[PDB]
Design a protein around this nucleic acid. Structure first.
Ligand SMILES: [Mn+2]
Ligand SMILES: [Mn+2]
Ligand SMILES: [Mn+2]
Ligand SMILES: [Mn+2]
Ligand SMILES: [Mn+2]
Ligand SMILES: [Mn+2]
Ligand SMILES: [Mn+2]
Ligand SMILES: [Mn+2]
Ligand SMILES: [Mn+2]
Ligand SMILES: [Mn+2]
Ligand SMILES: [Mn+2]
Ligand SMILES: [Mn+2]
Ligand SMILES: [Mn+2]
Ligand SMILES: [Mn+2]
Ligand SMILES: [Mn+2]
Ligand SMILES: [Mn+2]
Ligand SMILES: [Mn+2]
Lengths: 107, 97, 97, 87, 97, 106, 98, 80
DNA sequence: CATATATGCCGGTCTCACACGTGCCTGGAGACTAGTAAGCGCTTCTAGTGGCGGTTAAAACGCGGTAGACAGCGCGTACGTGCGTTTAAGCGGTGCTAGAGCTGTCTACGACCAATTGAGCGGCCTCGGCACCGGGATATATGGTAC
DNA sequence: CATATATCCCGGTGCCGAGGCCGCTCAATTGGTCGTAGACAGCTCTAGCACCGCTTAAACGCACGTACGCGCTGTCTACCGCGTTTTAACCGCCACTAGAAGCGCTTACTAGTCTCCAGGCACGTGTGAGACCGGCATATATGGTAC
């Protein structure tokens, strides 16, 4: 017999089965196609990798091994497209970007 | 005794982390943020897909509804890449049946 | 002995707090205020500590955000000092009223 | 069968310094003396609005303990989505 | 010409207009607005009711979820009235079993 | 034999239709018997409130038929409706007459 | 000759347009703009007449709102005259601009 | 020559007056043109995305209504 | 004061959209069955509450003085008015047919089922990352002074 | 130029949270069943589009000049920086138990099905609300000029 996980067959790290269950148990439609949770799990995996890439770079610039919420904030707020996606979201313990208005600088 | 089974995307977030930054870790709180992020974008995409099906009198959310949802919700370059990554996973899954 | 000119320490403080992520309101005052306000909505409520940390993270992030918009309203008026009327204009344009 | 100490004037625990620090992180260099009372006003309205919704989720759950999740759903309701506390 | 059937609340908006203001009528555009309004509040309350049920691991949206929805959605006085009109009509409806 | 649950609850608004729309809208697996009555009642309440004020706006305007402007006038003058409909545009609604003081002549 | 002082007609026009609900953009220029902007996303498109009207209702309503907030930003700056920098601040605070 | 110029200095005045503007700097009209274009761009983009999804070649009022909803500009009176 | 013109109003005149009566047709509402969601008992035990005292960092206060808020001036021109001229929007029109969108036939697909099995979880243990500390290297802002 | 005071960046130290091993076990996988959603193609005919040529109204451009934006200046005091003194946060520990969270029983509730029956629809009307509007009446802005 088999059992190899739909994740394997789609070539994804994100769990297709779980995603299909959450769609079905989430009251979004009567029916959920077989491709839907594959496609979804792939988008969530792409966005994760994208932010983990920038955030790891922030951790390393910051001479640290470990991504902390500040590294996720630096990553998101310094990327134009992520910043817009998370425009109305608050990262606990993220702080803000260093930004002083020009007119407040001494002459 | 033996606390309740609380699901989480953490296992997957660590896997993608090790692919992209093999020597980089992540703190509890940072994992909390990644969990919230995946739950948030799930709901937003699921939500728009639901609306799309309903507007077209369809009973079924297919990869086509996900792909329109992704285009309405993601900014420019992020949507192009997400769509291409999603279409790839469907094609690969469709032929692995 | 030695004396920084007005605005030099303010600049230093902006650089300090913009680098850090630590909550800037003291924890106990903030909790007492949460307990007071909620009690007036309903007697004999308990709080998970993490429900108080969530409320304090949300409140401080709201106020930092408002203070940025308030600052822009001062600067638009050819001022460098934030005043109540800068908060009011920011809050009106934001649709908070 | 005991007592709860009664809570009074706790808005004043949002002191001048704490407000100044929040304004610093917001890039404010100079602060009118009237800003501190105005800020207390605005904070209180914010806490009231969010706690109102949180407690309503709590009462709905038949609970006597307000959870992080009640706070997180309330913040989500108000367009103030918060990551790091569940959901 | 084979008709083609599209529902609206217009009949019910007339029945209510005649209660509150028996000698006044309504333009078709104004009826469009009242139709947009009813569908909008429907979606808002149902949506909230939907989330209330999910958060509390419950399969059923009862009048209790509708009520809590109305408490989150409507401002103070509108909410108290709505809660009255709501509780009353459920009382009156069970008593006529 | 056979009467509306709308008349059993004393409502003009359709309890049957609302039950169907609830079931068909993927809000939940199942829907309580009370839910659609409660909801239909809340929609009737809010419809009466708007139409009451908008009706008034129609008289204050010497008109027997409510147009969109009457509804805009009715919603933006009521604190609580204005808030409920804070992010809604009423087509052909216009705005409230409102000039900023400093703009009026000396 | 006869001349109303500068500002007096401006006020009449305010009173006049705040009193009415008619669209203030000419329908055909607007319609050609809608069709143009849309070509750049999908070619060979037809529009329902009501779809152009919905878009014009939504745009005029948005611009009138924005002009209100702009007017407040001008007045905040001790002015009676809206400038681009008033529109910009309104948009920044609304969250439209970064 | 372009269609955006179809949104005239006078039509922009009228809109400013409805929003209670007494005096209008000359730089406003191009500034409004650019803002209006971004507004129509964002809205029509989503409207057309809905049209493509229904496999239609006609933009419906309902596509514009759903698009306005998504963008926080809910419009009553067109089939909401 | 008087004079100009914008705006409001009346009463009449018309027109077309509203709101009415008439099918008709579907989408519901009275049974009725049958299975599960959830209410409501009882238990477990987590984590929320309140209380105390050593320490000390944060808050508060008053002082002194500078730099920014604010008001008053005065200059220059960008605007608002109104006019005469040009342009194209709107309109009523008569086609002309893309395509919205409905019906009717037929797979392919997705739900449901209910045994089978490894993915993912809660524990549990444990070092290596990092928080915190103090030393010595700059970097800047301000003050003393020579020219 | 000189000097004072913040902040950097360095190892060094020690703590405890991330992250990896385990073994248990549900939720996901298989693979077979069956009902229907939706794909496809034909057909209809709604409504979107387009060329036309009047007829105004609205846009245009121009030229006048005023009230407003704007930069300068001078006044004064509110707000910053800092020293000293006060205060209550924090920490680390108690001790106590409310109520959150979980389980097992148990049954009204609800969905799923047929049948029927009338509620809500598209249609077709004809008629009064309101749009227009001519010309009249009222309200208000603007200036003249002589106190
Ligand atoms: Mn109290
Ligand atoms: Mn074509
Ligand atoms: Mn007189
Ligand atoms: Mn009349
Ligand atoms: Mn159960
Ligand atoms: Mn003292
Ligand atoms: Mn002064
Ligand atoms: Mn100048
Ligand atoms: Mn054809
Ligand atoms: Mn684990
Ligand atoms: Mn290890
Ligand atoms: Mn140190
Ligand atoms: Mn080091
Ligand atoms: Mn079908
Ligand atoms: Mn107990
Ligand atoms: Mn007239
Ligand atoms: Mn005068």
């Amino acid at each position: 017999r088999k059992a190899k996980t739909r994740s394997s067959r789609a070539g994804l790290q994100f769990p297709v089965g779980r995603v299909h269950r959450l769609l079905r148990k989430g009251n979004y439609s009567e029916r959920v196609g077989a491709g839907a949770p594959v496609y979804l799990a792939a988008v969530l995996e792409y966005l994760t990798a994208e932010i983990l890439e920038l955030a790891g770079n922030a951790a390393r610039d910051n001479k640290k091994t470990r991504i902390i919420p500040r590294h996720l904030q630096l990553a998101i707020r310094n990327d134009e497209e992520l910043n817009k996606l998370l425009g109305r979201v608050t990262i606990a313990q993220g702080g803000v970007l260093p930004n002083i208005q020009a007119v407040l600088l001494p002459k | 005794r033996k606390r309740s089974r609380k699901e989480s995307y953490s296992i997957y977030v660590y896997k993608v982390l090790k692919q992209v930054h093999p020597d980089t870790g992540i703190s509890s709180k940072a994992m909390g943020i990644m969990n919230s992020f995946v739950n948030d974008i799930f709901e937003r995409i699921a939500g728009e897909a639901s609306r799309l099906a309903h507007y077209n009198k369809r009973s079924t959310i297919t990869s086509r509804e996900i792909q329109t949802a992704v285009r309405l919700l993601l900014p420019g370059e992020l949507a192009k890449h997400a769509v291409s990554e999603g279409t790839k996973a469907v094609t690969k899954y469709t032929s692995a049946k | 002995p030695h004396r920084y000119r007005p605005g030099t320490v303010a600049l230093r403080e902006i650089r300090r707090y913009q680098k850090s992520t630590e909550l800037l309101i003291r924890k106990l005052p903030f909790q007492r205020l949460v307990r007071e306000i909620a009690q007036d909505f309903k007697t004999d409520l308990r709080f998970q500590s993490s429900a108080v940390m969530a409320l304090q993270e949300a409140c401080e992030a709201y106020l930092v955000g408002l203070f940025e918009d308030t600052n822009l309203c001062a600067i638009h008026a050819k001022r460098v000092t934030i005043m109540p009327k800068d908060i009011q204009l920011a809050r009106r344009i934001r649709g908070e009223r | 069968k005991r007592h709860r100490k009664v809570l009074r004037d706790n808005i004043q625990g949002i002191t001048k310094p704490a407000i100044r620090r929040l304004a610093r992180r917001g890039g404010v260099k100079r602060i009118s003396g009237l800003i501190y009372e105005e800020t207390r006003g605005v904070l209180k309205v914010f806490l009231e609005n969010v706690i109102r919704d949180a407690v309503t989720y709590t009462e709905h759950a038949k609970r006597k303990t307000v959870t992080a999740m009640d706070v997180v759903y309330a913040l989500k309701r108000q367009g103030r989505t918060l990551y790091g506390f569940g959901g």
